Structure 1
Amino acid sequence: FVARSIAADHKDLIHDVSFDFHGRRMATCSSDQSVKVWDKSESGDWHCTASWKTHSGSVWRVTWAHPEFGQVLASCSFDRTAAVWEEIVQSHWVKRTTLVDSRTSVTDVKFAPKHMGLMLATCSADGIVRIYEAPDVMNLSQWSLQHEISCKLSCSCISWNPSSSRAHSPMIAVGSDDSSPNAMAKVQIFEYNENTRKYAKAETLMTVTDPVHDIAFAPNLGRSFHILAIATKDVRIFTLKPVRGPTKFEIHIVAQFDNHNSQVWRVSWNITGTVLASSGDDGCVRLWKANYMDNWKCTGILKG
């Protein structure tokens, strides 16, 4: 890989970077209460086309929505709010709705896949994962809270299941970064059941007891089982194979990498869900790929 730097000009540390659906746009949120949207031209240079103050406290996560709903950004911050930003055409970004249901800091915010409509999930530090919905995609100023899930642990990361199949029920994983001395599972997986119309805890990953800083479901893309990547003191990849009430999965760990030799903060799959990038405290990005024998191996080490 060929590395190139970008003059972020952010007054504080950049907490999250999220590409758009088409890959042509970028959104970076930092601790300076600023979210910057970068659009690249034919020259290949990323130009900061927008930079506006968003929240009162540090902004943790910024996520994009599917373009059929328009250029929509959701940002969670330290001020217990998850704001939804829409672009109106110069390039002006307006705040649509401030989600103030959480009584504590909202660690992560993530848009649900396209086939669910325009649904938003926010996880708070008190163990409550709130799932929102916009009944009218043309009116983004009205969001109705559909479900709220108590995860009994300080949530730090969520990841929707990007499967578009009708054979896979809606599924959201919740990771916890709590560092209690007791050994309890730090990742809980909730599956929406159509019969009860309520999210229920389907599978729990007991093997993960270290604090979790990032989780990322692999893009399904024609597969039959679900692959989950977890960021901890090491890098773990779990495969969720449904069996023929919540669905029961034959959970098998297929990767465990300590090549970072430190805490791993972020995990991000590619578009095909075949190469996983892990960023740890070592400041290196390690791309992990699986051969035809399901032996995950590092295909490159990338340094700043």
Structure 2
Amino acid sequence: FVARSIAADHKDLIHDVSFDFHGRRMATCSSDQSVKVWDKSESGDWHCTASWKTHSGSVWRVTWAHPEFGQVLASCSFDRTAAVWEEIVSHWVKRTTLVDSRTSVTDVKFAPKHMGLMLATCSADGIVRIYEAPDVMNLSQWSLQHEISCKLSCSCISWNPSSSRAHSPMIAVGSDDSSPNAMAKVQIFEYNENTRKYAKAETLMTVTDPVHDIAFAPNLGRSFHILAIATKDVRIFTLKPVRKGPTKFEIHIVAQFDNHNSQVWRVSWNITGTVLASSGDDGCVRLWKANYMDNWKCTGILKG
């Protein structure tokens, strides 16, 4: 549709942009070790309302939390740390700092609201950790609960946003290392209510080129799961549980598009889980949709 420019005033590259739960605030992070927060006025113009130095290295990702716990943000950096910020009555203060990593921390993600207040982080050494805050009234007491260990270097993580009581929690983690061999780059871990531990569930064998981002889809009504991957091309998968250890899935493939003729960097679904947006090296954003015959077309080409 219509495109309007924003004056970021960042001294280096921007690595992430995130919206909030009510859709009227936005956060941007850059390699000048800074974080900015933007607000939208009645006239429909975005203007900055805060900016403060956050880490001592490049900041990769920044994410919001549910408004039930307050106005909370999380960040990850090249200096092997993760921080939690809150807004009190207006400046932002630091609440915690997680320093267990030995290498650069690459992604950070908040858990869906019905599990509580949980956070998951991923490193370049192949270790994924899950934290928790047992008492919401103190946002400075986190406690480590689980620790998974993959065989390769992680680059992205994603939670399952389903809210059903027949689905157990699961998280998908992807790699980015380029090796002369041919090993699977995407793995899925599932929770076991009986043994109280995360266990391996499936492995996406077909994916062999390096991965850059993955994203589940907002369920809202269904009995199966949809996953999107941003490799050299765009791929979309489907996982449907089988009737009743880890649950058994039937993995298929439903879409593959090489329309970018480049490397795909980012993917993003929408609020209803029906339209997929992808960005590539050419510099264009593309939109994908599916009809009632389960074919995935294109819907628009947005160019900057």
Q: Deviations over 1:159-198 (max 9, x none)?
A: 1000011111001000111111111111111111111111
What is the alpha-carbon distance in structure 2 between the residues aligned to residue 145 and residue 263 of structure 1? 36
Q: Deviations over 1:196-254 (max 9, x none)?
A: 11111111111111111111000111111110111110011111111111111111111
Q: Deviations over 1:30-83 (max 9, x none)?
A: 111111111111111111111111111100010111110111101011111111
What is the alpha-carbon distance in structure 2 between the residues aligned to residue 165 and residue 44 of structure 1? 37
What is the alpha-carbon distance in structure 1 between the residues aligned to residue 291 and residue 14 of structure 2? 34
Deviation at 1:279, TM superposition (A): 0.7
Q: Deviations over 1:242-268 (max 9, x none)?
A: 111111111111111111111111111
Gaps of 5+ in 1: none
Instruction: Report whether the alignment pairs 1:296 with 2:296.
Output: yes
Equivalent residue, structure 2, for 1:39 = 39
Equivalent residue, structure 2, for 1:174 = 173
What is the alpha-carbon distance in structure 1 between the residues aligned to residue 238 and residue 50 of structure 2? 39
What is the alpha-carbon distance in structure 1 between the residues aligned to residue 6 and residue 65 of structure 2? 24
What is the alpha-carbon distance in structure 1 between the residues aligned to residue 150 and residue 218 of structure 2? 24
Equivalent residue, structure 1, for 2:159 = 160
TM-score, with length taken from structure 1? 0.98
Equivalent residue, structure 2, for 1:284 = 284
Q: Secondary structure at the match of 1:23?
A: coil
Structure 1: 4+ residue segments shifted above 6 A: none
Equivalent residue, structure 2, for 1:50 = 50
Deviation at 1:270, TM superposition (A): 0.5
Q: Secondary structure at the match of 2:68?
A: helix
Deviation at 1:131, TM superposition (A): 0.8
Deviation at 1:8, TM superposition (A): 0.8
What is the alpha-carbon distance in structure 1 between the residues aligned to residue 145 and residue 300 of structure 2? 42
Deviation at 1:2, TM superposition (A): 1.4
Q: Deviations over 1:118-157 (max 9, x none)?
A: 1000010010011111111121111111111111110000
What is the alpha-carbon distance in structure 2 between the residues aligned to residue 153 and residue 201 of structure 1? 15
What is the alpha-carbon distance in structure 2 between the residues aligned to residue 260 and residue 109 of structure 1? 28
Question: After the TM superposition, which residues 144-293 of structure 1 pair with which residues of structure 2 at under 5 Å, given as runs?
Answer: 144-244=143-243, 245-293=245-293
Equivalent residue, structure 2, for 1:93 = 92
What is the alpha-carbon distance in structure 2 between the residues aligned to residue 137 and residue 215 of structure 1? 30
Equivalent residue, structure 2, for 1:136 = 135
- RMSD of Structure 2 on Structure 1 (CA): 0.8
What is the alpha-carbon distance in structure 2 between the residues aligned to residue 251 and residue 65 of structure 1? 31
What is the alpha-carbon distance in structure 2 between the residues aligned to residue 284 and residue 201 of structure 1? 36
Deviation at 1:117, TM superposition (A): 0.7
Q: Secondary structure at the match of 2:253?
A: strand
Q: Secondary structure at the match of 2:223?
A: coil
Q: Secondary structure at the match of 1:271?
A: coil
Q: Secondary structure at the match of 1:67?
A: coil
Deviation at 1:115, TM superposition (A): 0.7
Q: Deviations over 1:260-281 (max 9, x none)?
A: 1111111111000110111111
What is the alpha-carbon distance in structure 2 between the residues aligned to residue 180 and residue 94 of structure 1? 42
Q: Secondary structure at the match of 2:179?
A: coil
Equivalent residue, structure 2, for 1:71 = 71
Deviation at 1:293, TM superposition (A): 1.3
What is the alpha-carbon distance in structure 2 between the residues aligned to residue 75 and residue 288 of structure 1? 30
Deviation at 1:28, TM superposition (A): 0.8
Deviation at 1:109, TM superposition (A): 0.3
- Count how many residue pairs are aligned between Structure 1 and Structure 2: 303
Gaps of 5+ in 2: none
Kindly, what percent of the aligned residue pairs are identical?
100
